[PDB]
Structure formats: C-alpha cells, structure tokens
Amino acid sequence: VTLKESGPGLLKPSQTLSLTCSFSGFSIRTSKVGVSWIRQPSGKGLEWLAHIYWDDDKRYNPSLESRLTISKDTSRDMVFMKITSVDTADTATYYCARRGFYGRKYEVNHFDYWGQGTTLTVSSAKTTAPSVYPLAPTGSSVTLGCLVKGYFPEPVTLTWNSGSLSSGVHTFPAVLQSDLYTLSSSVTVTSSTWPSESITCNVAHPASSTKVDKKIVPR
Amino acid sequence: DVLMTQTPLSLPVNLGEQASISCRSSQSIVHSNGHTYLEWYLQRPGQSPKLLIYQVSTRFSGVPDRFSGSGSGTDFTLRISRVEAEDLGVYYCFQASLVPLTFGAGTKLELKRADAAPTVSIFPPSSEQLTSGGASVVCFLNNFYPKDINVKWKIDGSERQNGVLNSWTDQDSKDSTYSMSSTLTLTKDEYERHNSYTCEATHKTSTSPIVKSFNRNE
C-alpha cells in the first residue's frame, strides 16, 4: 500500500489549491476505506481538514470547512481536495491519510497509511534574487555571519570557503515573512584564523540563477 | 470542539530510560458505537506521521511492545519502557470520535543533554545593506540547551517587538544543542536616528540575562 500526494508547490494568495492523492497496492472501490486530508502549517502540529467515505459522504473541520471541497474518483483510485482563496497561512505540508481497518472490521479503523505529503508555499512574490550581506563583528574566537535576505522561492545553498569550513557553522532554516524568505548562517573560528585568512559566504539561488561570494571583512 | 491537551510539550530523555506522555480530552471521546477512538501517532524528524496505537491501547502492526497506551474517557497515557533512538520525534494524540477530529499540539521526545549557555553575538548592518536603504541587526545565540530561551531587542534602551525574524536550528546531531538567529530589520533612516543596539537573552544557564550591544557610531 502506497499513497502519493500531488500539488502545485507554489500559489499566489486568492488562488485555488487543487490536491490529488493517488493510491497503489489496493483498490478504493473494493476496500471501502475512508480517506482524509491533514495538514501541518509552518512550525505547527497536525490539523485534520476533511474526510470522504466510500459512498462519497464527507465531513469537514468547521474551522476551514467553508473553503474546502473533498471528492473521489473510484475508477482512477484517487481522492482530491480543493481549498479556495489561499493565503499565507495555507503554507503547509498536505498529507493524504488512509483510514484503513483491521480485516472486515470496518469499525476498527485508523490512519494506517500516510503519504510523504506535498508542500505548498503561498506568496505574491515572483522569482527574486537574494541580497547577501557580510556580518563582521579581542577574545580567542570570532563569530562571523552571512545574511541572505529577500529571496523567492526556496531553496538557497550556502557554504563557507566553498565547503571547506564546516566545523562551527550554524545555518538557520529559511523563514517566510511578507512574501520573501530570509536565511542566515554563523561561523565561529579562532582569532588567529580571521581576518588573517579569508572567510567567504558562497550563496546560490538556483531559481534566479544567482551566485554570490561575499568575503567577511573587518569593520 | 474537543481540545486535546498533551503534557509535557517537550520531553528530553536519555536513551534506555522510560518515558510517559499524558493526553487529556476536554470531554469524553467514547463514541456511541462503544469504541474510544483515541490514536497515538509518531512523526520522526524529517518523516511522515505513523500510527503507533489505536482504540487507546492496541498497537498497530510492527509497533514494538515497549510502547503501551492506557486510559479511558478523557484520560490517556502513552508509555515507552526503554527509549531507543528510533523513538525520538513528535508524538500526537488524536480523537476520531467527534467532528472536528482533533490532534494534541505534539510532544517532542528528544535526546537529553546537560544545560549549556548560549554564546551570543551581535552584528551591525553591513555597509552594503545601508547603501541599499535598509538596516538589519543580527543576533546569533549558539550551542545552548535546553531549547527554551527568550530574546529581547532594545534600541536606545527601549524594547522593540516589531520587525523581528527568528529562526532555530534542529537539535545538533552530534552535541545535542540548539542555536537561534534573530534579525531586527529597520530602514537606514531609522538606524541612523538611534545610538545603542542591544540583544538580550534570558536562559536558565545565567542568573542574569546575557547582553550583547553596540553603538552605531563605534
């Protein structure tokens, strides 16, 4: 038994999200399993959205119900979800989950299989190159950084001295704010290392085909 | 609606120790059909959620017997008898008796380690940013434990809550620590109006807050 979600990846606010979940290894028709959609918004836990039974009866989470439409196609072995008027808060991972059951005991049911999910990011932004800024600061070590601001979409790649500097690096997960991402990274080295040796933030943003190498230089 | 309250929300453990997570429903989740649709799901880091326990205490196929669920009505407990590395992640209780079906907030079972103070660094706006009309001030708080920490920005002695962007690393896979980055973004014009810039961290490893500051004109 496998479940595979598909979805658009990115949408602009006010668009309609159309998701599909496709099943393998068994038949929706024969099994009569119920199917739900559950989501995981950015930095939150799981939230149940909607469920559809084998006879096309449906239940929704009242908190979102007015925006949701679940449906199924037994001939295609697929279940669908539409969410109208998407906005920033719909940025989440969307999971398909099968409400399988023990044997022919329909009442002993539970979410026995989950898909890998499909991630959606909702933003008004067109493809935007980041700005990349060097963060320069007596003691035995020095901490330097790199600020990668105002890009879309994910991902960016960041390395230090073309990957040769890895110990003492913390590269922070990107965060979406006002439709653009910001990310940052710190690196800590001995004071005898910098500024006597060069330390450079290497940033690539493939969507905009941008590649910047920013040397961290003392103030 | 049925509120599902998990305690604790964070549960550091040493491997080989027992662990326990409580889940309280705000009303009975006994269904009229006679079953109590209480489920436990585990979401391991970087993975999809998976079923552990259903109908309060029945283990799903392939779930080892160190997991045990108990309770009734509104009062539910998951116990793990000897925690293994594969057990770490976020545990959710879940009720499927009443609509909306509701999850707990999640309990993060993580690898415990000794407390560690953040190393804190503060960074003025770069010249490049300033020339573009912007001004971000960055504060890094690295290699601390536990994860709970409060970061406060002040400009000329006054707290700034707006224009802040925070991010946290996942627990380090080697040393088990956390790190955080906080960015306060202003205009160049605003930055040039003020003098002192301060990042203040309150953490259990210091009896006083850890303060890093600079003056725009240094």
């Binding site: 009569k32 469920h51 039974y53 239940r59 009442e107 | 009443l98 609509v99």
Partner: peptide, 7 residues
C-alpha cells in the same frame, strides 16, 4: 457531532 464509523 460524532464522526461516522461503519459496522
């Protein structure tokens, strides 16, 4: 309102 469970 209860979630439907078939028998």
């Amino acid at each position: 309102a209860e979630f439907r469970h078939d028998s």
